[PDB]
Design a protein around this ligand. Structure first.
Ligand SMILES: CC1=NC(=N)C(C[n+]2c(/C(O)=C/COP(=O)([O-])O)sc(CCOP(=O)([O-])OP(=O)([O-])O)c2C)C=N1
Ligand SMILES: C/C(NCc1cnc(C)nc1N)=C(/S)CCOP(=O)([O-])OP(=O)([O-])O
Ligand SMILES: C/C(NCc1cnc(C)nc1N)=C(/S)CCOP(=O)([O-])OP(=O)([O-])O
Ligand SMILES: [K+]
Ligand SMILES: [K+]
Ligand SMILES: [K+]
Ligand SMILES: [K+]
Ligand SMILES: [Mg+2]
Ligand SMILES: [Mg+2]
Ligand SMILES: [Mg+2]
Lengths: 552, 562, 551
């Protein structure tokens, strides 16, 4: 007879889930993962990889996705993936086994932790199964909470005995409709239209407005609408790390992404050039977790701000917008189009000096004795990505490190989520699972990953998963035998390094990749790198390129 | 001027701490780790490894140890190490950075999570620093809670601004005495002596008593006292996984360790042989977390039970002992020596058919077509360990998987904590950090690790750490391209496998180790394995050995797991 | 067929419980409270009263006691009594109903709150019943946690469907032995004997040591041992609010209790007189929650300190003893007796000028125009209590307010728990339920209560309960139409009053008492008060006396 395991998988399938990423433990006695046609288990080497792959797949598809761990340390390993989903915002259903219900004694029973208490603070919803037939409503409530802004993970703890139980389960009675939200449910304030009208009045008076676009605008399905608005009114579009590609590469209104590191990396007044003459900042789908902070746009002349979010402002200590529009982003844009229909095009401010500086970095022709420079690596990645991908396609993924901010400034993104990284959570090791999720979401598109040695090696074991699933991801590992960003922080705070806290010995990432069944090569200049990328891109198999780098 | 970072490291040093294991993030702006002489940072590739290394070092030394992570995902990664400490019982001080105090908005600020709320359920103590100078008393309170039975981790969250602040800090006034407990503080119930007297009366009357010894007895410093008692009264000693070695290898009262998997692995009524004629079970330092459950000794005739623990019974639903002695394990044995001084030695029961069956497995001379068998692997490890180690020295560490239970049955342990595994938490990937902790705790002794391909590869990146620290650990990876134990569970529950949930492709672990700077070789039979182990043991550098294995299990033989 | 309701009551009975204090809601459909012979329900008018009565009964008996509330607001009302138990230290088993298990949706289902999450932070143990038959082991684990130092409450949430279920319950198979601890379980540190030896060495060198005694010393059964030690070596005994009576009234070494307002109340340097020449402070059974803080004894010369407690020091930020002895209090004293066996008795420092002031103060013969003064009220209560009670018997209870300082400093206590108040939680309204608990614990002894109009009226409806149970409690309400202590706080912090935050209109507490079926009178001076107290003490029924006072 069908058990709660069957009813769980079947309800996930009802909500459109076709994959469950994870690592299975002794609960395999209760759940096989062949119970339901249409839903496949995806086995990873570590649970973090499973949680992050589900996060990224949910981000790109706009649909709830699922991950799985065993009791105790399975669940705690998965919780870094759950943390990724809560901070980076994605509708993930996270599932973990638990001790038999009558034997739940957290910190006393073997492998028994208080899973709900541990995960509740980092989730939208967290619950433990008590009566087997209720798993269907627990999945529904989990999905409901996951798909309400700000989107995030919902957790269900599954005692092994109840998971394997058929008590009260009757599969001859069909499930009620799932009614999965088409896009995230939003918070909406009374009088938001009047606030939007106030925003329109500010725009009317403004000389140099900008749209600062966050990922919430993408979730809302507002990219085309935002593009049509910006083009009609001649309003520049600036993005967070994660909203790169809301305008195509080369678009005249594509003013780029912001990172707090940009002035320092470029040795240039980048933030001033971007924001100094701006008098109106519309933060479209604003989220503080994306890490574009008010202090970053507060350059030069005094500015008015308009916040647009499907959430109430969680941070009035930090951000007090002149006008706060609490509503669905697309709803706002459509109302705003009507309000501003009679408006003509603004004159936009000049950022050519900044564009010139960025272009100069990307073109850097020097051959360095002590390894490549990251801007040269990314330029090479851009070139081959443009070659390999159809227009408006491809994904470049970045793990976490100093190099990541070069990715933010320099990496090509020709579509929404065309550049992927972790903005809210920023766990190192993020690259591999994100590339897995991205490649699975976009099976026919090229997927490049860039990762540093510190972050990459934290989670390198899932190279075998890439090989096993034959995901034709091309990986570039930029190696300096250091947690590099952290050495930068040591010098910022102390004016010196301390090697025991940051320095590694040598890892041969070419040999490492090959041990996992992934072909690899070392590249030490633009010529070797382009050659390696082009090879990887046409290989029909995963490929890894180790590149020695230095930071100056 | 010295900051809270200085005051924190200085207070850890006051408590005997000489190493902080971890991974540092942007809080490096507030803490360098050179502030205090005598305390060094030990950088790992993952925070899990840092937490487990501190746990194991704490277990072997009996002294509080320390680990470190950054905010958000640093702290969540560390949390698996914290769960290790809370379930396995070790006094670990876990420290993690947090967002600037004025900018703490969990799940809204970049990398900001509610660390205290996430860690509190899995720790003895969990706090966030609020006033820089108070870090000294927060460390003291952390150590206080960590060193009370049941021992476990204490957590301090450190907002980056406060960590790098000198506000209220004065290092010209010396710190008050640390007064670190030399052994864990324990719970003691009034009238425990009378309970111990009732236990003595039961022993007088018992025909075949046994001592079932757990790790808490070792922490109490009760190994010599327990051995003397057992030897005088001729009482057999049976152990949990990590209490192996409380009596030397070859001691006649060393009746071995219990695992629920033993009948199935041996294809033999092992638990029945061990327990059927026993009429009295004294669980000395009992802890349910170690996973030797009442149902495992409940074989054959009805037994009376005595529980001795420095804790109030947390599980009366499962274990209702006839006599409950809530006191320090050593205190009990010393009282019990007096109560039983005039007792005649007992006649111990026979377990020779079990001993013969175990010996038969270890000596298995067959050559299999599809890899070695794990019992042959452990036999080979035992031989070389005995050669490499001084008498009463050496450590064999086991990661998690089906092979771990072979370790429990078959692995040599000639001293307390001579066989190390994770009994309470059982996180796969445990092996590397535990071997790191063991080798550092026992710098002049051989340290062997056995791990399976599933668990080993979950946490294999820390091979580089072993290489970097030049810890001469000899690792054996038993490879069957599968999460083997989990395939067993599939078959127990469903009478068939499902490969997508358990099966891997090929990983070349010899090549993997070499990529990390660790010399390695492949061994496919006893001859090749002994040669590899002897090479590793004499190498003065880490060494890895990959061994192909297979299981072919009998799912019908594992009913004891119910 | 017997249900979880029967099994719950049976297990409480196994642990020696004979009363359940509470208010019953719709869970009455699942539990009647007549299932088990020997355990009776005591209905209160508010759940706070039920929790505090259980707290006080548990303190005096030394045995676990029990209270009951319904779901939602029943549980939140009970939580102030739970809070009383956790801070004041008493082994209480708190029980509350919950929504039907399948319908638990906190903050959505009618009356459904997340009771475990709400109560967990203020308890030793907190759990929700999930499988009916497990109630027995849940009760045992509740008692285990309640009876480990620091003793406190354990909470069990009881979904009403599971409470009325017989599933898996078989009362033909007798319960395993209860094994209720006879005194609290505590922790013991390795090397504590060596620590006690270091404490002995400090005592040998000390000119003027003192013993500061807390209630954990009483729970340990150490009162006779402490008295014998103090008498032999001539060491003064100072107590917390809660440990008054460890020495008899009149004993030469009975230096009494102290408060921060002692100097201001007496217009005398009382605290400096007590502590200035002291060179060694032994805090025997120390607990920060009793509110005798290190700052209290840190007067005059520098002092060495010895902490003795069956707990690890929770407050190293505040108290860093020179010697910390973590062990059972009785075990410590017995060891300390051996270590100090050959020591010569000490000289005591002169506190006679303080004793003379207190005696003069209490005898204050003036007849004031605008109501009595509180010292006169306490003095009168002391007189009639001495008359009414057998030697070493009687209880004086104090509610919370400015007047409570007078109870602490001056009220008669001729036995352990002879004077009761709330030192840890200090909820106003504490007086009535504490007097209920005291009188039930000591049915043949006089029980006097003093309460102010603010605190008394906050929980005055349980006068009806005192009447209904016919507990011959004598209540004195000191009335000044104000939350007086709070007006004092306004003046300390702001140098002025603000009446909207402190002042009341008139309440006739005599007519209030009589409306509840409690006879009452108004007393306006020593003569009228002494007469009212004597009448009440001999009435064989509850009596209430209103006294106009002024500060
Ligand atoms: C549930 C509850 N309990 C309370 N105690 C309070 C506040 N509150 C009081 C209190 O505790 C003050 C602090 O005392 P402490 O410094 O010793 O800690 S004392 C009081 C009425 C004092 O007035 P009274 O009873 O008429 O006596 P008196 O006028 O002060 O003598 C009130 C309101 C608020 N809620
Ligand atoms: C340790 C760390 N960050 C702190 C940290 C620690 N642990 C986790 C799980 N996540 C983070 N973000 C970084 S950014 C390492 C980056 O090193 P790298 O991947 O070699 O890149 P680079 O050297 O360019 O900075
Ligand atoms: C996945 C798993 N266990 C569940 C699990 C999941 N995730 C974690 C963090 N820990 C555990 N224990 C095991 S035992 C894998 C064992 O595979 P192996 O290391 O190759 O050993 P073997 O094949 O002998 O069973
Ligand atoms: K192309
Ligand atoms: K040897
Ligand atoms: K890992
Ligand atoms: K009398
Ligand atoms: Mg690097
Ligand atoms: Mg395997
Ligand atoms: Mg008043």
């Amino acid at each position: 007879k069908p058990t709660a395991a069957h009813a769980l998988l079947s309800r996930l399938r009802d909500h459109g889930v076709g994959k469950v990423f994870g690592v299975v433990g002794r609960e395999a006695a209760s759940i096989l993962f062949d119970e339901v046609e249409g839903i496949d288990f995806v086995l990873t080497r570590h649970e973090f990889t499973a949680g992050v792959a589900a996060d990224v797949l949910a981000r790109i598809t706009g649909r709830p996705q699922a991950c799985w761990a065993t009791l105790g340390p399975g669940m705690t390993n998965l919780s870094t993936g759950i943390a990724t989903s809560v901070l980076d915002r994605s509708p993930v259903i996270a599932l973990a086994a638990q001790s038999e219900s009558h034997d739940i004694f957290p910190n006393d029973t073997h492998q028994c932790l208080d899973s709900v208490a541990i995960v509740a603070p980092m989730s939208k919803y967290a619950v433990e199964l008590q009566r087997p037939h209720e798993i269907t409503d627990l999945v529904d409530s989990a999905v409901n909470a996951a798909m309400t802004e700000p989107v995030g993970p919902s957790f269900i703890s599954l005692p092994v005995d109840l998971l394997g139980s058929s008590e009260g389960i009757d599969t001859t009675v069909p499930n009620p409709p799932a009614n999965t939200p088409a896009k995230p449910v939003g918070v909406v304030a009374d009088g938001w239209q009047k606030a939007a009208d106030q925003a329109a009045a500010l725009l009317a008076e403004a000389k140099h407005p900008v749209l600062v676009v966050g990922a919430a605008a993408i979730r809302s399905g507002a990219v085309p609408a935002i593009r049509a608005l910006a083009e009609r009114l001649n309003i520049p579009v600036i993005t967070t790390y994660i909203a790169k590609g809301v305008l195509p590469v080369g678009h005249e209104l594509n003013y780029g992404a912001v990172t707090g590191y940009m002035d320092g990396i470029l040795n240039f007044p980048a933030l001033q050039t971007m924001f100094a003459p701006v008098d109106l900042v519309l933060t479209v789908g604003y989220d503080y977790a994306e890490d574009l902070r008010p202090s970053m746009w507060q350059k030069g002349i005094e500015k008015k701000t308009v916040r647009i979010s499907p959430t109430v402002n969680p941070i009035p200590r930090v951000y007090r917008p002149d006008v706060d529009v609490v509503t669905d982003v697309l709803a706002f844009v459509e109302h705003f189009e009507t309000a501003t229909a009679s408006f003509g095009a603004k004159q936009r401010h000049d950022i050519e000096p900044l564009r010139a500086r960025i272009a100069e970095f990307l073109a850097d022709p020097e051959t360095y004795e002590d390894g490549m420079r990251v801007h040269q690596v990314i330029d090479s990645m851009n070139t081959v990505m443009e070659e390999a991908a159809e227009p408006g396609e491809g994904t470049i993924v970045s793990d976490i490190g100093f190099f990541r901010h070069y990715g933010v400034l320099f990496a090509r993104a020709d579509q929404p989520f065309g550049f992927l990284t972790s903005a809210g959570c920023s766990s190192f090791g993020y690259g591999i699972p994100a590339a897995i999720g991205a490649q699975m979401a976009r099976p026919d598109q090229p997927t490049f990953l860039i990762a540093g040695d510190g972050g990459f090696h934290s989670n390198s074991s899932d190279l075998e998963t890439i090989a096993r699933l034959n995901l034709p991801i091309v990986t570039v590992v930029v190696n300096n035998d250091t947690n590099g960003l952290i050495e930068l922080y040591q010098n910022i705070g102390h004016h010196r390094s301390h090697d025991p806290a940051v320095k590694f010995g040598g890892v041969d990432f070419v040999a490492l990749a090959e041990a996992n069944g992934v072909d690899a090569t070392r590249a030490t200049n633009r010529e070797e790198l382009l050659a390696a990328l082009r090879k990887g891109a046409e290989l029909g198999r995963p490929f890894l390129i180790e590149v020695p780098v230095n930071y100056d």
